[PDB]
């Protein structure tokens, strides 16, 4: 489980080798808590293939506005320093996979 700050985003996400999934979230977001246990399973089954990161938008208000986030939870797939795909809202552990499989 990788926690991020605004200061660490550059190195952790953008300068990163290999694919990375970022969960922009908050404590006061019902649906965000819903997928917290789901995201842990993917951190196992996509070992080496993916790294899973989290950014809490309350304590780090600087990053989300840069990416045009419309709400939370927002899953962002990064490859180099680039957004590959986007998932908005809480979802099944199965729809998440089909999303990861194709990109």
């Amino acid at each position: 489980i990788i926690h991020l700050t605004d200061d660490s985003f550059d190195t952790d996400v953008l300068k990163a080798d290999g694919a990375i999934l970022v969960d922009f979230w908050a404590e006061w977001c019902g649906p965000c808590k819903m997928i917290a246990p789901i995201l842990d399973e993917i951190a196992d089954e996509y070992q080496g293939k993916l790294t899973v990161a989290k950014l809490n938008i309350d304590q780090n208000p600087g990053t989300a506005p840069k990416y045009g986030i419309r709400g939370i939870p927002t899953l962002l797939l990064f490859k180099n320093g680039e957004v590959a795909a986007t998932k908005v809202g809480a979802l099944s552990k199965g729809q998440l996979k089909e999303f990861l499989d194709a990109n």
Binding site: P37, D40, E41, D44, E45, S92, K93, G94, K97
Partner: protein
């Protein structure tokens, strides 16, 4: 109507056996502490498949067609403490020493001493069957009783009765001398068992921690998962009804085993929803079927989707809210699976739900990724045997050094069989 006898060997075997029988009693409406039913009522379902009736209906009883064997007495003592007058006391056989985690003790030493009694109880159970359809052997193979005597008894079973189907349900250790005992047991499970369903403790541990939030999972937690799967697999044999697709152990293994050299199976269950919420939170059919075929749902530390399916059975039970949807889904899965050796895809349905889920499914598969689980084991065995770690343990016990090489080679012959089936 087919009869099944369940033989359980060693700690794991018997603790699982106790949990299985309690659940089956509850499914059939049989009092799990006394073998009785309420006044005037018979059990639900085809109870005689797994139970025999003792005496009149007044003071009488329904008795699990069960035999429990151990060397150490703690576990069978515990069964006696928790299970009233359910079991036939003559079918709970133990001694005094444990096998001290030594396969050779169970196969050649103290195990040989228990065999005539155990075999004699098998005789009695067999003969009191209208039509015996199979024997299920419940055991862990990381210790010395389940592995050694489990090996001894399956061999013995096949020599004396021949034609009776014998299915092993075998628990595998999670990453001591466990890798040694597993490998030694595997030989017999390869050559003599008609089929072997693995339960990988590593996967069970993860599921219990992951899906259920148990920081320090116990064996009780792991046994819940096994019990559900066992109840679910045996439901085709224990119930009848207008929509209930009755399936014998014979028919099941026939469809799951395409060649005698490929008879190792894995299973998945759904829903894996935490017991905490069991009846309050339900999955729809979609999520349920989706989950069933997910790599994170199999009772094996590996990924069936990255390998190839030789064969498959989906065993559904309980409420069916939307049969066109379920058929559409299974048909879609059937066309999505990585295939080899011609495949089978069998679907069973049982009306009767289990005691904890309104609807549930068990997936049994003959899949080539079982090679991964087995590979993990052999790498650990080789790591100890390369330097002869606890080798004298087994040498001073009757096995010869060259004959354990034969068993390491025997298991390798099985791991190569499944690798060849993939490519």
């Amino acid at each position: 109507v087919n009869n099944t006898i369940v033989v359980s060997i060693g700690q794991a075997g018997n603790q699982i056996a106790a949990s299985f029988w309690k659940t089956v009693c509850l499914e059939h409406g049989i009092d799990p502490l006394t073998g009785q039913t309420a006044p005037g009522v018979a059990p639900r379902g085809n109870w005689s498949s797994f139970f025999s009736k003792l005496g009149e209906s007044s003071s009488g009883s329904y008795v699990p067609r069960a035999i429990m064997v151990d060397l150490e007495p703690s576990v069978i003592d515990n069964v006696k403490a928790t299970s009233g007058s359910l079991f036939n006391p003559a079918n709970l056989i133990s001694r005094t020493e444990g096998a001290g985690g030594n396969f050779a003790v169970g196969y050649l030493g103290a195990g040989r001493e228990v065999l005539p009694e155990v075999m004699s109880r098998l005789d009695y159970e067999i003969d009191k069957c209208d039509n015996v359809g199979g024997i299920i052997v419940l055991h862990a193979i990381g210790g010395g009783t389940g592995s050694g005597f489990g090996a001894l008894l399956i061999e013995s079973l096949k020599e004396k009765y021949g034609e009776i189907p014998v299915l092993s349900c075998a628990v595998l250790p999670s990453p001591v001398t466990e890798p040694y005992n597993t490998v030694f047991a595997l030989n017999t499970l390869r050559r003599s068992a008609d089929a072997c369903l693995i339960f990988d403790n590593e996967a069970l541990f993860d599921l219990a921690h992951r899906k259920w939030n148990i920081e320090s999972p116990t064996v009780d937690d792991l046994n819940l998962l096994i019990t559900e799967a066992l109840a679910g697999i045996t439901a085709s044999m224990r119930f009848s009804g207008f929509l209930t697709v009755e399936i014998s152990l014979r028919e099941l293994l026939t469809n799951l085993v395409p060649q005698p050299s490929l008879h190792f199976l894995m299973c998945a269950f759904a829903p894996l929803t935490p017991p905490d919420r069991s009846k309050f939170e339900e999955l729809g059919i979609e999520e349920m079927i989706k989950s069933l075929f997910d790599n994170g749902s199999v009772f094996a530390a590996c990924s069936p989707m990255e390998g190839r399916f030789l064969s498959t059975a989906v065993l559904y039970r309980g409420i069916m809210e939307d049969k066109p949807l379920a058929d559409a889904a299974l048909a879609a899965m059937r066309e999505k699976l990585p295939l080899t050796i011609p495949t089978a895809f069998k679907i069973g349905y049982v009306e009767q739900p289990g005691i904890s889920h309104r609807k549930s499914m068990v997936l049994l598969a003959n899949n080539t990724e079982i090679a991964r689980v087995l590979d993990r084991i052999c790498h650990n065995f080789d790591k100890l045997w390369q330097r002869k770690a606890f080798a004298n343990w087994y040498l001073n016990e009757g096995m010869s050094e060259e004959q354990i090489n034969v068993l390491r080679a025997s298991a390798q012959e099985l791991v190569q069989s499944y690798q060849v089936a993939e490519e």
